[PDB]
Assembly symmetry: C6
Homo-oligomer: 276 residues x 6
């Protein structure tokens, strides 16, 4: 199968309940760590019998409830939320924001976890070659951290190709973040996850949207047989459905760690959406 | 698949819940705009995983409720209703008018949306060759705007072949409208939509009519297997089930815009049905 | 498929809910009108998507309720009942009369309409060649209209081969009516119709008879699969399940119309059953 | 198919709800009448669409109720019961007698009729060749009608091979009755009939026996699919499930009618079971 | 098929609801009677249509309820219980005794009879060759009937190879009993029988054991398809599921009958289990 | 099939409800006893018809309830618990400890037994060759039994390769225990066992984990068909689901029994987890 342990993760663009243009979390990025059924040196893989099943239901009354429900499946190592406008750039976040602004409707989220294995590390890492070259191309200073830098977060949001930004090294940092993300996965439950977002008026007016992680694309969620077939494809193509991450700056040389931290704050502000 | 972004739309003859002689909205017209998975220049296409599902139910007590339920799926850009006797020339509108005039029955509408992708433009357009030639054959003045013109809207409704009309340029404008419509689609959700119209007496007397948009013709709506097969055919032949339009006069030269607006008002009165 | 627009109809022997010896209304007669997906000149055919479904239920307390339930599906143009002992010569009429005479039971009728298309004319007709020859062989006077004619209606009911009738021209008229019926179809909804007649005692004593119009012969009404298969055969062999007729004398030369009206009154009296 | 109109019938050994050693009424005998979809001369055959279904339930508190439930399906022409110890020699009669003698149980009978056609005669008959030869072998006198005849009904019940009977012509008459029965079918509803005899104690102690008429042997009555398959085989092998009979002595020469009537009374007493 | 009429039966080791090491009653022994669809001389076989079905349920509060439920299916001719520690040596008897000793649980038994035919004799029998030779090797006296005989029933239970027993002829008699049983079947209903023994605590703590007679070994009792397949194998391999027996001493020469009765009492005490 | 009678058993690492890395109890070890459908000399094998089914449900409020529910299926001969930190080193034990520490959730365990046969011994054994060689390599004294020995249980838990332990003979004893376990199976019920561990919050928040013993790996527990297929594979690969064990020291020479008992107490403390 595919290894997602050590994969990069964009906490701003990620969404652990899914996206209609991806079969997994859209924040998952190419692998960042390099490793050595089979156990990776320094970590572990524990395979399940069939699928470890779990289900959740939550009434999402505001944006904070949706944020908390996403943070349950994509948090810092230990369970603390990533924050920093996490998930706010994803489509599902914007869709739910539009639906929750309507006070005449109430939305619930139902998660169905079909877990197939667990993997993790415990801590002297070696990174991938692509990540190493990318880091070697990074400067030691983040230009937008300087007060009165012409390239501010709004300037990047409005026009990143303006002269105010193209003269600084900000596009290099943002290209790195766009390539590898802001965090990396240190622990994960992989398999399939089928989540239903159900919106009810105040007429039995009810709407139901289906969001899927893992397996092959399912033809019909209402079909029982197609659902079972999707569950059969989950065994073949499992993908992370609940994971914990560590910040990427722990993997950079210290002379770039502070500038990278400033770069990810800048990125979280320019790409992320404050509730406005 | 087939591109419907920029397709013409007759707001008078259209019906966004369907027509028994069409697999889609009977008002959709051949493409009016020309464009350049793949993204059209100036717009966007966002593909879904499987089907984005949604369901609605509404009690239709009068003609205005039906107008509102159709306007939900076929409106001006921004969500405002098209109005101007919209949908009033379609078969479904006349059938429902006949059913709602009977005060001894109550009718409900259940929509089932099976959406596969979204497309749109944001605004320097280029039109199709057929639309350009059609516009080049149009005059600069609409004759029926002149007061005391022998060719009025009622005269066209009674006999459009009469001398009062064949001497004016009105038939040219109406042939253009009959070819390309009155608006054009600027944003759309495409796929399938199965709508049930259920009429109950005041005896468990209940009638149910099925209207379908998108996919291949379904053999049996009561059959579960035939319904699932139709859902499988929606992936192959998706069609607009909820869209937003802009008036066509924005695409004509400025010297013809006023005459075209007068022509579409004339058309809305002569072909459209006021509640009488 | 087969064209039933303009088909003859015997309103006395007809029965729009079916017959165990026919797959359609036993009163339907060979085509009377000649015509020119495809639209017949002077009329229209409107094809449905799948099946337009409808269901009815009625408690039949007496013969008049059954007469009204049949008249709903076989009426004059406009909805008025045909009458004139309509349907009274059909088998189902006699069966239900026998069941309703028993005051210790109560019978209900459940109709299930599976309509596939609608057809009609609007009015200069030409008839078929067989109908033209039949009319050319008709006299201008109906002998039984003369007072004290030896050939009365009951005399025809008892023995039509008696000398009292074989000397008059009545057998010619009755042969014509027996060939083409008394009316002809001017509007029709065709497809399939499954009607259940359920008789309950006053012990859960219940009897259920099934009567079918349209499609191929169904093997088992209780089998779900065989019922679905019948619904699939309705698409192939659709037959009129709800129609409106016009009297046949409108199609005869004026010199024969009065004698034909007298002939159909005589026929309705001799063949039809008054509730005795 | 097989014609049962005019078949002989042993009213003593018959049982219209069935027998496990026969697929039909065990009292049906070879055809007695000879005849000429197709209509037999002197009678009628009326075919149904699919199956005319009917269902009954009755609580059988004593032997008279069971006698009445059987007589409904095998009666004299007009509906009057055959009587004369009818059905009393059949196995099902003896089984039910054993069960109804137990006052600690209560038995119910549920009939399910799946009728496919009706046939009948109206009255100059010709009998079959076998029946004619059998009658020609009959004497004009029945010996056991003579008072103090050594061959009585009890003597026949004890030992029919005793000298008291073999010297008289009683064995000839009883051989004729054993070959052709005592009545013959003049009207019949043929098809399938599944009857359940359900006995409840006074613990939810319930016993259910299945008795089947018509069609092919069904594999499993509790299986839904095997039941449907049996219903499909009923179309192929329909058998009388509700019929009306006339005494056989109407078909014999007048000089033998009285002796045959005495022979059938003798047979009903010697073979039939009075409730002792 | 296999004939079980006249088969020997060990009433001590038998169990008519089944055994996990046998497909039938573990007490059935090789055939003892010799006989001559086809009818055996002196007896009868009555074949059923499909399966004569029956169901029973009983709450087994103590050992006597279980004894009565087994005696229903294996009794003396006429319905009287065999007694004499009948069934007490079988495994199922010991299992249920262990479960009924626990007063914190309650056990119910559900029988499902699938009967295919009935057979019996009515009474000059001839036995099989093996049974005749076995009887010819028997003495005329049973040694353990002599008072104070060193070989008692308890001594046989403790050690049958001790000098106290091997000097007497008791091992010969017990070898005969071990070969042919203690009774023989004179009437039987054969087919399949699925019995569920359900034990409930006093938590929805429930245990269910399945015991089967007849047919082929079933793969899964909870599977509907495997159950139906077992029912189809019952048609191929029917076995006695409810029978009536007569003591074997009626088949021995009179000089050996009394010694055989003493031998079967001895066997019932030494092998049977009194409720201790 | 495979013999598990006489297999070694590690009571510390075992878990009789399963493990996601094993198809059976993870404590089962290679066979320790050597033996001679077929009956092993000194023991017995009793095969069932299909599956002996049983089900249990228990609310697990604390670690002791889980310990008791596991001890039901893996106990000393007679039913007494093994104790000595039994099961505490298994993955399932640690997972349940983590879940029961959360006082905001309540966990239930549902067992489903599908038993296929029972085996046992009654007591002069000969052991396997591997076990005999392993015992011959054992010393007669356990070094860690000496007070103030540098190699204690905590030292073994922290670092077993330290000089404090590698100088003593403790690694030899622990290698023997790691190979053959601490007990061996003397009685067993083998087949399949599907256990559900269901955790409920205090929102219908519910989680369900599936643990399986026996048969082939099941693809999907929620699929009915995959569950039935697993039940079909249990017949092919039955494994112990409820067994009773005896301590291994009964199989060692008397001069090594005390040192082995000290070695297994040492192992139970060093590898086992006390509730801290
Ligand atoms: C990768 O890192 C691991 C430590 O996690 C180390 O053991 C290994 O040697 C490293 N890879 C190489 C090629 O040295
Ligand atoms: C059509 O218009 C688009 C703007 O949306 C433009 O990019 C494109 O070049 C035009 N077509 C051609 C052939 O130039
Ligand atoms: C039949 O009638 C139509 C109009 O109803 C007419 O156009 C046509 O000419 C007629 N048929 C022939 C053969 O002329
Ligand atoms: C049989 O009887 C019919 C009348 O029921 C008669 O028409 C026919 O001639 C008879 N058969 C023969 C061979 O004559
Ligand atoms: C078997 O017994 C029957 C009577 O039960 C008898 O007629 C027959 O002769 C016996 N068999 C032989 C071989 O004699
Ligand atoms: C092992 O012991 C069995 C009895 O349990 C004995 O029959 C057998 O001979 C021994 N093994 C060998 C290889 O002899």
């Amino acid at each position: 199968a595919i290894n997602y342990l050590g994969a990069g993760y964009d906490h701003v663009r990620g969404n652990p309940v899914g996206d209609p243009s991806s079969m997994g979390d859209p924040g998952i990025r190419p692998p960042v760590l390099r490793f050595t059924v089979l156990q990776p040196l320094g970590g572990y893989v524990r395979q399940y019998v069939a699928c470890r099943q779990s289900e959740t239901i939550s009434e999402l009354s505001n944006l904070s409830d949706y944020q908390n429900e996403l943070s349950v499946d994509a948090s810092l190592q230990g369970g603390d939320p990533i924050g920093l406008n996490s998930f706010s750039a994803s489509t599902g976040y914007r869709d739910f924001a539009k639906e929750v602004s309507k006070k005449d409707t109430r939305t619930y989220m139902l998660k169905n976890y079909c877990m197939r294995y667990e993997a993790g590390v415990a801590q002297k890492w070696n990174v991938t070659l692509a990540f190493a070259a990318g880091v070697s191309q990074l400067p030691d200073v983040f230009d937008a951290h300087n007060p009165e830098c012409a390239c501010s977060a709004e300037q990047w949001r409005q026009d990143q190709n303006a002269e105010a930004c193209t003269k600084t090294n900000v596009p290099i940092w943002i290209s790195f973040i766009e390539q590898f993300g802001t965090h990396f996965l240190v622990r994960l439950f992989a398999g399939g996850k089928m989540t239903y977002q159900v919106t009810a008026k105040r007429q039995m007016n009810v709407q139901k949207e289906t969001l899927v992680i893992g397996g092959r694309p399912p033809g019909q969620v209402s079909d029982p047989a197609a659902l079972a077939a999707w569950a059969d494809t989950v065994e073949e193509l499992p993908m992370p459905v609940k994971f914990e991450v560590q910040p990427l700056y722990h993997l950079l040389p210290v002379e770039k760690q502070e500038a990278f931290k400033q770069a990810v704050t800048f990125y979280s502000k320019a790409v992320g959406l404050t509730p406005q």
